[PDB]
Nucleic acid binder design. Structure first.
Ligand SMILES: [Zn+2]
Lengths: 159, 126, 347, 58, 66, 49, 31, 48
RNA sequence: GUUUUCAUUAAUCAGGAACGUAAACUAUU
RNA sequence: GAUUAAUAGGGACAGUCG
């Protein structure tokens, strides 16, 4: 691919290696995966959340298997929010970035509301069926999107 | 069928401000309607609008505007022509505005006279 | 029903465009200001309603918020920003003596009771608090993840440092000011156009909501509404508690002003006039006897509450006859003939 | 047309209501001091600045 | 293909009309189907998906059914 | 003036909240001579007795 | 008659129709 | 150019379809003779 | 109705084509 | 190399309906 390893790149490489071996009994797109890409920029204050960039059909491979893979990554890796994405290089690209940010849940609506002046605010409303375990991830989603693309959004559940 | 989606949306706006509603559901959205709402929001004839998707526009309005429309031949217009055009179009020089898809975008006539850019007279509201 | 003649006057020549905001001087008794739609504000004294005391072309857009300070000065809020004028000075000064723009599109104003602090509800989902004479940009308080515009804001008057405010997410939110953090958030079924606290009971608030309704809530227990007045046809654009804390004015989006009792839940009275094109801001005077209605026709009309009770000093037998009639109706108000003539009103 | 079509709201029974009115208010049937104490209204608003209350009364 | 289903329908109504030859509602519907077929076939000639010399009146029908 | 119109009050509350006599009843209703499904049920009851 | 209708061309609902002779007339009034 | 309260009252008695004329009437730079009479009948006010 | 496709194929009508004893009170709302 | 997939169109299928 592209990457010569850095201090967390070799870390995620060793992490995926010990998810291959010494465990499950579940390895589908893990063995056809090598070093891919990773990034660690802070979220909030004090906390961090790791994002990884994956080649484009392995995204649907990881959508086949992302449940409890991400959980094990969170627990055995530094106690932070793990996150997976597609690597790319336009508004459709931002659309794909958002829909790949929110991995188990489907987005529903994009409300682009202008204020009383030229300012405008974009708010994405999600599905109501998954609300319990994503509300604490909402801010991480917002700041990750902000850091990668630059447009400020805000994630919300409908009512 | 009037392919002028701009005229459809403005017809719904005039119907709403006539009936006394507070918010509208403009069903077919487009960027020209978005910028037209932008300039009416600049001049404060509309509260606050949002564009949602399947998309449509929801426009909280206060009830200050009287009439809106679109100039169907979309006539190109220079500066002295602009002055006489705006006095022939609005009921007063100090009430209402006329809209120009200039080469610098979409703006009102006072902004056109500030930036010294002419363009195509397209729409108007007062 | 013969002597119900409630309309008193019209404050001078009125404005060019509509009256979109107004506010009284809670310290004084005859100082009122009204900010119109073209961006002129006027300050009227109620003793002489011929010509205004002080006018200025304040802003470029409409004058969304307005208030008096506690010293003598006043504040105006528009999408341009907010400004601080001093209308009462031996030279007339049309230039503002303070100006703010940073903080986003401001939407409403409310002033403290005693100190020199005031809150402005912005459009970015926050309100911000200024303390005059030793602050510059003010502290912005907000809900943590919040986006939509907070429309109206009002300091609680009887209990200081409790701020109620309504946002266009069809939600009311309560703050606190000694601990600068939001406190509670309730989502109703429809958006609310204004919140107002009660100047006699410390915990009751009234929300004027686009549900054509006026809700009286208890601030400690937001689980159920304390009272639901339903008397309107269009959305309500304004509510105002009486300064004696027992009657309510609600000015509607249609051509109406409804006067209400605190525990009734229906129209004690209704005012309307062909010349009133819409109704946008209504508020009592501190007499609790004359109400003021800024229309959308550009008029500041002055009506009287208790529309059949003349003012001034009454002779003793006359006031005995009036109080006797009122207690008599309070007893026999439910028999058929009395009921139909007391409810019958020309709409 | 002179009977009442129904109970007024806060009351709970016919005996209660028809026995609670029971007394004419006007001066032909009561003394002057009692007439005053009956027709004295609930809220009494003289003129002046009716400001919101500062500190609690009780 | 849409044009295939439409020409099959035209073949069907034409065979029934040839067997019966008395009704007129069948003729009216056959006229409408022929108009729709000609407009769609025109669009497909313009986009170029079939030879520009491909024509159907009745021999294309007889060949496609035989 | 002020007493309860008892019939009106009972009707208002209804609107809010929602073997010797049947022989003379059937004698009264056998001179109409409407069949009257209530009279039908009453005749079935009188058959049952 | 309605007052707010502008005096140049015809108005049907929300659409405003101007004829080319009316536009050339306004141009001639400028020149 | 002066405009009386009777004329202003008739423009206001006319509905909201004359909002533009009401605004032009309330243009600020024009004097306003207040009237002292009852019926607000502008013809008799002007002639008187 | 669909857990169905092609993606402007559209609208309108000059010209043209298929169908064929009577009257007599009258973008929403 | 090939957008939304239209709250304009046509087509297919199924249960129907006159
Ligand atoms: Zn007069």
């Amino acid at each position: 691919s592209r990457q010569n390893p850095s201090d967390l790149e070799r870390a995620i490489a060793g992490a995926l290696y010990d998810l291959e071996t010494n465990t499950a009994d579940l390895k589908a797109a893990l063995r056809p995966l090598q070093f891919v890409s990773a990034r660690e920029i802070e979220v909030g204050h004090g906390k961090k959340a790791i994002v990884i960039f994956v080649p484009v059909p392995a995204l649907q491979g990881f959508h086949r298997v992302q449940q409890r893979l991400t959980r094990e990554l969170e627990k055995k890796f530094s106690d932070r929010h793990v996150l997976i994405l597609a690597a790319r290089r336009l508004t459709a690209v931002h659309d794909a970035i958002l829909t790949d940010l929110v991995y188990p849940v489907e987005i529903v609506g994009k409300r682009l509301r202008t204020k009383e002046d030229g300012s405008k605010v974009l708010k994405v409303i999600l599905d109501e069926k998954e609300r319990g375990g994503v509300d604490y991830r909402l801010d991480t989603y917002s700041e990750v999107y902000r850091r990668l693309t630059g447009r400020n959004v805000t994630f919300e559940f409908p009512q | 069928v009037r392919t002028s989606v701009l005229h459809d949306a403005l017809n719904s706006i005039n119907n709403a401000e006539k009936m006394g509603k507070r918010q509208v559901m403009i069903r077919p959205s487009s960027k020209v309607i978005v910028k037209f709402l932008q300039v009416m929001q600049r001049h404060g004839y509309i509260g606050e609008f949002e564009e949602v998707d399947n998309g449509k526009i929801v426009v909280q309005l206060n009830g200050r505007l009287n009439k809106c429309g679109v100039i169907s031949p979309r006539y190109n217009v220079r500066l002295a022509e602009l002055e006489k055009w705006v006095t022939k179009l609005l009921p007063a020089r100090q009430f209402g505005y006329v809209i120009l898809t200039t080469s610098a975008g979409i703006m009102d006539h006072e902004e056109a006279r500030r930036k010294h850019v002419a363009g195509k007279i397209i729409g108007f509201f007062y | 029903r013969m002597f119900a003649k409630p309309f008193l006057g019209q404050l001078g020549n009125g404005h060019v465009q509509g009256v979109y905001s107004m506010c009284k001087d809670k310290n004084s008794l005859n100082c009122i200001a009204s900010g119109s739609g073209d961006g002129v504000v006027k300050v009227w004294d109620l003793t002489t309603r011929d010509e205004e005391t002080w006018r200025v072309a304040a802003h470029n857009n409409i004058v969304k918020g307005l208030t008096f300070t506690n010293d003598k000065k006043l504040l105006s809020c528009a999408t341009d920003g907010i400004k601080l004028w001093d209308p009462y000075a031996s030279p007339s000064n049309t230039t503002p003596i303070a100006t703010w723009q940073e903080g986003g599109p401001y939407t409403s104003l409310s002033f403290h009771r005693s100190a020199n602090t005031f809150a402005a509800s912005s459009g970015q989902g926050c309100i911000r608090i200024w303390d005059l004479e030793h602050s510059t940009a003010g502290q912005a308080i907000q809900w943590p993840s919040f986006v939509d515009t907070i429309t109206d804001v009002c300091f609680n008057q009887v209990e200081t440092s409790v701020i109620g405010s309504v946002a266009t997410d069809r939600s009311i939110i309560l703050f606190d000011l000694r601990t600068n953090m939001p406190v509670i958030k309730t989502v109703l079924h429809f958006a609310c156009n204004r919140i107002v606290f009660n100047p006699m009971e410390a915990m009751n608030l009234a929300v004027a909501s686009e549900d054509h309704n006026i809700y009286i809530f208890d601030a400690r227990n937001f689980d159920k509404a304390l009272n639901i007045q339903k008397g309107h046809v269009a959305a309500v654009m304004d509510v105002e508690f009486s300064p004696t804390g027992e009657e309510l004015v609600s000015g509607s989006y249609d051509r109406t002003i409804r006067l209400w009792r605190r525990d009734a839940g229906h129209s004690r009275d209704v005012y309307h006039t062909k010349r009133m094109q819409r109704v946008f801001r209504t508020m009592w005077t501190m007499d609790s006897k004359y109400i003021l209605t800024g229309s959308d026709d550009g008029n500041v009309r002055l009506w009287r509450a208790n529309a059949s009770e003349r003012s001034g000093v009454k002779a003793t037998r006359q006031r005995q006859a009036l109080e006797y009639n009122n207690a008599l109706l309070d007893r026999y108000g439910h028999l058929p003939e009395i009921r139909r003539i007391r409810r019958h009103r020309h709409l | 047309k002179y009977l009442a079509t129904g109970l007024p709201h806060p009351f709970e029974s016919q005996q209660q209501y028809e026995r609670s009115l029971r007394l004419p208010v006007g001066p032909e049937w009561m003394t002057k001091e009692t007439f005053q104490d009956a027709t004295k209204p609930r809220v009494i608003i003289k003129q002046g600045i009716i400001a919101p209350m500062s500190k609690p009364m009780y | 293909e849409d044009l295939y289903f439409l020409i099959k329908k035209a073949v069907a109504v034409r065979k029934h009309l040839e067997r019966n030859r008395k009704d007129k509602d069948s003729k009216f519907r056959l006229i409408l189907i022929e108009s729709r077929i000609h407009r769609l076939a025109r669009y497909y000639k313009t986009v170029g998906v079939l030879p520009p010399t491909w024509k159907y009146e009745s021999s294309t029908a007889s060949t496609l059914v035989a | 003036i002020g007493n309860l119109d008892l019939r009106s009050e009972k009707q208002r509350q209804a609107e809010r909240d929602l073997n010797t006599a049947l022989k003379k009843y059937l004698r009264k209703q056998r001179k109409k001579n409407i069949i009257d499904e209530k009279r039908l049920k009453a005749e079935e009851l009188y058959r049952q007795m | 008659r309605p007052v707010d209708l502008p005096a140049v061309g015809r108005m049907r609902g929300a659409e405003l129709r101007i004829s080319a002779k009316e536009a050339a007339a306004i141009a001639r009034e400028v020149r | 150019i002066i405009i009386t309260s009777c004329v202003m009252a008739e423009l206001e008695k006319l509905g909201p379809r004359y909002r533009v004329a009401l605004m032009i009437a309330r243009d600020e730079r024009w004097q306003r003779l207040t009237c002292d009479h009852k019926g607000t009948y502008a013809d008799d006010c002007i002639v008187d």
